[PDB]
Amino acid sequence: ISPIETVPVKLKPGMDGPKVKQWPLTEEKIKALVEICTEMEKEGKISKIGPENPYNTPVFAIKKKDSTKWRKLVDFRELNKRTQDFWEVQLGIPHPAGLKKKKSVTVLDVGDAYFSVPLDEDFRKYTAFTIPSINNETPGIRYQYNVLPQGWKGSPAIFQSSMTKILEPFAAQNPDIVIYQYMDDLYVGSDLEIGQHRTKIEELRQHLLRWGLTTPDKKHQKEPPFLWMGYELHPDKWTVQPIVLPEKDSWTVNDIQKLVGKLNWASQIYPGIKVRQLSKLLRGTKALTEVIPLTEEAELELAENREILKEPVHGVYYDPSKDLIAEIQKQGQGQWTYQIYQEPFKNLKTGKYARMRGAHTNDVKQLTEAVQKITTESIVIWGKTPKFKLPIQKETWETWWTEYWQATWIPEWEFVNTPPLVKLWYQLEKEPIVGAETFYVDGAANRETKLGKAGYVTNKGRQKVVPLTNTTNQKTELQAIYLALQDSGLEVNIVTDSQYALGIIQAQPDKSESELVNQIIEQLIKKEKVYLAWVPAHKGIGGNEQVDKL
Amino acid sequence: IETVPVKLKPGMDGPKVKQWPLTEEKIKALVEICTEMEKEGKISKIGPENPYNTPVFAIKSTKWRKLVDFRELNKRTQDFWEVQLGIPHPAGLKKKKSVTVLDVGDAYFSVPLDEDFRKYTAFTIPSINNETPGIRYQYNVLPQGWKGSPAIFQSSMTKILEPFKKQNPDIVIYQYMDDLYVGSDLEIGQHRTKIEELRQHLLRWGLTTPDKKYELHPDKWTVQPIVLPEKDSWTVNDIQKLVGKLNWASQIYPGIKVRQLSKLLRGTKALTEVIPLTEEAELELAENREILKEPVHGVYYDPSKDLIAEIQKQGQGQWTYQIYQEPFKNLKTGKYARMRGAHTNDVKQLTEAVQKITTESIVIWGKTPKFKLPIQKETWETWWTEYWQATWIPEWEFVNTPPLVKLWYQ
Ligand SMILES: N#Cc1ccc2c(Oc3ccccc3OCCn3ccc(=S)[nH]c3=O)cccc2c1
Ligand SMILES: [Cl-]
Ligand SMILES: [Cl-]
Ligand SMILES: [Cl-]
């Protein structure tokens, strides 16, 4: 226990304490439970109770390595489901790229952390348990908890608040010592000489011990590199813990998920990791134990990742006196990669952005989206936004954001002439082209038959109708435009009734999940002037009525 | 004095909203502001047995101001400040020639808050890189931005204003959250001197209004009429666009006729061909033009429904908006043109437009609309507080579908 003040705790309103059955157990189990309940009671962490307490909670016994120890287990689910909600404990963890170098770093593990913090007195009656008789002939040993039980909803957050209050006196006396708190650990850094630092560590240990918290001695205190949360914290660098990409003939859905996970994890420091093809295989994974084949693109992507992972890479810690720079590169296939650095040959971290959700996209829009993701991450990790280095010209971006329907925030950025560049591959005409043939296009299909047709009629008397099998009322509308893009000169006016097809093209995409749209894009690049115009269908207006005959 | 008990709607738990990550500059401003507020008793630190949270932000002048987003708590306290302690909305404030808005939020900070209710006002000052769990506070006084704060203070406000209302019985005064809207038909100079009289009256009674060195003229507030293109000469394309917009307008105004216009373009002609209009055709155009000049019929405000504001980007610092409750039943439309400036970030114009629309909606109906914002969610959530100067925050959502009708709402 400890002299810390207890946090007051309530049951969820309208509920009452857990009254749960205690199913019997073996004699060797009931024995090892008493060997611990007497030593727990000796240290005051529990206390025998009478019959007045009407509540109860299941008790179980289990062992590790069949070792001498036979740990007690209490399933506090019924209590936890009836206890008030607490402030949510830490969700995310600090990122190594956001740490600032300290000349010395120490790690201290608190033992019996939850059992070293007292529990609100009025709430102790709801923590009662029972060690049963050998044959339900003897009475049971009623007990109760005095400290934060392991597996109780409020234990993690009450400990953190208790530790934070306990650290307050030492932190005031030692204003230059950094103390990170995380679960049952304390990561203490300082800019003092080793001997001076080691004395302050011993000072912290003694302070923590007077408050009832045990902590390892220098004999048991770890040393760098520290393996924390899948990272490798070295005194002047950080990197991820070694990645193991397994070799298999049959890759199940679960195996692919694990592989995509390790690859995402490695992407924060290893530049160029790609997971598009592997994740595409996951689409519609359904059963986790199903065996799925590998696309040649997927095996190629995995091979490049193995090549990247072959050599080791490390990142640098953060320096607030130096600038924060972000640089982005387009990997292709709708994939982008970025580095965050302050110095040229060392990066704080890396990462990648993929626009999986959008079927149709524009490089400029993707680049803008990737900037947004980097901006949010920079704020989380360093408390500020980076100065961007982007492969786009100002006149290219200014043109796009001027005419884009949505509002865009274009931060400070400088052009980096490192191809692939980001450009506008074509641009529709804002007014009709005089001296250009005017194609009135139309298309349609039957939903049941799936058979459709796409055609056009021009102001010069030209006419075509092409049959289409296994299509949609939407695909034929796109096919009509593609037919008029073909069979037309370098300048063409196209008139459609399909707001769908107008919407897709007016967005000016440069890539899509439809081969047809990719072919239309190819034509639009090859043309000189294209004006796309729209009219209401079935209004019988001009040329559209004649095309509707199709 | 003793505090007014505040009860949440039955079966409604408290707000549990996530704190956004902030710049280091903004975290430090919040730590400074909250350290002062803690010293003045206005807020206190809290432990882990409080699970609720409400986002906090920092806005600006050259002095950092704190802004709590009480949207969720307001929804969960609607009965307390809308039914039990509701503040009625005057319908004559819109009629006034000039309307001035005065910030009176500092009044609430004297009044204590019900002890059993303070836990639901909990907010978190974030740390960087998840170093610290966060500095956690709750209010001991009526907080700004909570809708129950003016509702509780209402009786004190009605008392402080009554001497001024007697002298000036033609001046409309309406309180919405932290602001007073004062409307008069006086000339600008007379109205401005009247506003200073009210400011001095309030200061005499202990109400500091930080107005020491917003004028709105709502007589022009209306649903703007659709304007067909006026052309000396007309092309096939021009007629095509005219017919299309008229067909779209037919959804709103019945009686639109385009059959004669449709006939005027006959055969597979060329878009750049110049088609002179028939005498019959001009008659249809003249009838549709007059039909659109008049206002719609049967468009009334429903106070049981929520107001909806839609905005579309038009280019060259121009934005257009419509306020409605049901489709094609616009209660109000307008066009906000950014005051021509060097700083012109689309976010700045969108943020300024959203504030303008919200203020009008308060003056007209006494409530704010839910915005359909033409911007990416994360971009807005990152940058909206940069130019936010209001004390309230409307509801909003983000539209990912490009309109294709921007020319129509010109
Ligand atoms: N397991 C474990 C573990 C160990 C240390 C952690 C940690 O250390 C610091 C602690 C305090 C200040 C700065 C720190 O880190 C700066 C950067 N740094 C890091 C390591 C070394 S050896 N040297 C150095 O400069 C911060 C956060 C979590 C930690 C978890
Ligand atoms: Cl991604
Ligand atoms: Cl061609
Ligand atoms: Cl709830």
From Swiss-Prot, chain B:
Organism: Human immunodeficiency virus type 1 group M subtype B (isolate BH10) (HIV-1)
Motif Tryptophan repeat motif: positions: 380-396
Transmembrane residue ranges: none
Domain called Reverse transcriptase: residue spans: 40-216
Reported impact of residue 180 to A: 76% loss of DNA-directed DNA polymerase activity. 60% loss of RNA-directed DNA polymerase activity
Result for mutant: residue 149 to G: Complete loss of polymerase activity. No loss of RNase H activity
Phenotype for residue 180 to R: 20% loss of DNA-directed DNA polymerase activity. 21% loss of RNA-directed DNA polymerase activity
Effect of substituting residue 182 to I: 25% increase of DNA-directed DNA polymerase activity. No loss of RNA-directed DNA polymerase activity
Effect of residue 178 to E: Strongly decreased RNA-directed and DNA-directed DNA polymerase activities. No effect on RNase H activity
Effect of substituting residue 103 to A: 5- to 12-fold decrease in affinity for dTTP substrates. Strongly decreased RNA-directed and DNA-directed DNA polymerase activities. No effect on RNase H activity. Loss of pyrophosphorolysis (reverse of the polymerase reaction)
Outcome reported for the amino acid change (mutating residue 160 to D): 16% loss of DNA-directed DNA polymerase activity. 24% loss of RNA-directed DNA polymerase activity
Effect the entry attributes to changing residue 179 to N: Loss of pyrophosphorolysis (reverse of the polymerase reaction). No effect on RNase H activity
Name used for this protein in its record: p51 RT
Phenotype when changing residue 180 to V: 22% loss of DNA-directed DNA polymerase activity. No loss of RNA-directed DNA polymerase activity
Impact upon substituting residue 103 to S: 5- to 12-fold decrease in affinity for dTTP substrates. Strongly decreased RNA-directed DNA polymerase activity. Slightly decreased DNA-directed DNA polymerase activity. No effect on RNase H activity
Phenotype for residue 67 to V: No loss of polymerase activity. No loss of RNase H activity
Outcome of swapping residue 160 to A: 71% loss of DNA-directed DNA polymerase activity. 61% loss of RNA-directed DNA polymerase activity
Effect of residue 380 to L: No effect on RT p66/p51 heterodimerization
Residues given in the record as Mg(2+) 1 binding sites: 103, 178-179
Impact noted for substituting residue 383 to L: Almost complete loss of RT p66/p51 heterodimerization. Complete loss of polymerase activity
Site (Essential for RT p66/p51 heterodimerization): 383, 396
Reported effect, residue 179 to A: Strongly decreased RNA-directed and DNA-directed DNA polymerase activities. Loss of pyrophosphorolysis (reverse of the polymerase reaction). No effect on RNase H activity
Top-rank lineage group of the source organism: Viruses
Result, substituting residue 281 to L: 68% loss of polymerase activity. 10% loss of RNase H activity
Recorded consequence of changing residue 244 to A: Complete loss of polymerase activity. 25% loss of RNase H activity
